[PDB]
Amino acid sequence: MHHHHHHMSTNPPPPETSNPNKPKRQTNQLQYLLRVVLKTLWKHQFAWPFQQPVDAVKLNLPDYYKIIKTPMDMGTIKKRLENNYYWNAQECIQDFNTMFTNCYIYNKPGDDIVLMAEALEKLFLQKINELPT
Ligand SMILES: COc1cc2c(c(OC)c1OC)-c1ccc(OC)c(=O)cc1[C@@H](NC(C)=O)CC2
Ligand code: NA
């Protein structure tokens, strides 16, 4: 009997950050999203949980990828912006929104991680209010 000791929880492959066949553009709005929005958030004291995919093995979180089927993180967004993966700013904004929403879904309103996400989301909304027209 193995008693399933080998069936450990693993991480899914991370989201795609490069695809030569996807339509992409560099727009002024996307350049602002990299240079101002992403760079500002990256340096925030609460950014660290969001700078890479959730590692279910390190964090002992066998349920995470059962609940969250569209994961997103800022490391992925950074690589997408640097690799010019996006066609327009709304595609990138959607990724930020997914990242925040995932955190609110998985956790509960009083939790420290949710206060961290809310602080980042506040700063995100401040910065995209000045998105170039
Ligand atoms: C045992 O230590 C940690 C364990 C976890 C997390 C975490 O980062 C704050 C830890 O600190 C290193 C954690 C990480 C990221 C999350 O989303 C980005 C999340 O939704 C949720 C979490 C954690 N949830 C809570 C309520 O903080 C659970 C897993
Ligand atoms: Na929740």
Curated annotation (Swiss-Prot):
Post-translational modification: Phosphorylation by CK2 disrupt the intramolecular binding between the bromo domain 2 and the NPS region and promotes binding between the NPS and the BID regions, leading to activate the protein and promote binding to acetylated histones. In absence of phosphorylation, BRD4 does not localize to p53/TP53 target gene promoters, phosphorylation promoting recruitment to p53/TP53 target promoters.
Protein location: Nucleus; Chromosome
Coiled-coil ranges per UniProt: none
Free-text tissue specificity from the UniProt record: Ubiquitously expressed.
Site residues by UniProt (Acetylated histone binding): 107
Bromo domain span: 25-131
Additional record remark: JQ1, a thieno-triazolo-1,4-diazepine derivative, and I-BET, a benzodiazepine derivative, have been tested on tumors with success. Treatment with GSK1210151A (I-BET151, a I-BET derivative) has strong effets on mixed lineage leukemia and promotes myeloid differentiation and leukemia stem-cell depletion.
Family: Belongs to the BET family.
Biological function: Chromatin reader protein that recognizes and binds acetylated histones and plays a key role in transmission of epigenetic memory across cell divisions and transcription regulation. Remains associated with acetylated chromatin throughout the entire cell cycle and provides epigenetic memory for postmitotic G1 gene transcription by preserving acetylated chromatin status and maintaining high-order chromatin structure. During interphase, plays a key role in regulating the transcription of signal-inducible genes by associating with the P-TEFb complex and recruiting it to promoters.
Illness the protein is tied to: Cornelia de Lange syndrome 6: A form of Cornelia de Lange syndrome, a clinically heterogeneous developmental disorder associated with malformations affecting multiple systems. It is characterized by facial dysmorphisms, abnormal hands and feet, growth delay, cognitive retardation, hirsutism, gastroesophageal dysfunction and cardiac, ophthalmologic and genitourinary anomalies. CDLS6 inheritance is autosomal dominant. A chromosomal aberration involving BRD4 is found in a rare, aggressive, and lethal carcinoma arising in midline organs of young people. Translocation t(15;19)(q14;p13) with NUTM1 which produces a BRD4-NUTM1 fusion protein.
Descriptive protein name: Bromodomain-containing protein 4
Source organism: Homo sapiens (Human)
Residues of the full protein shown: 42 to 166 of 1362
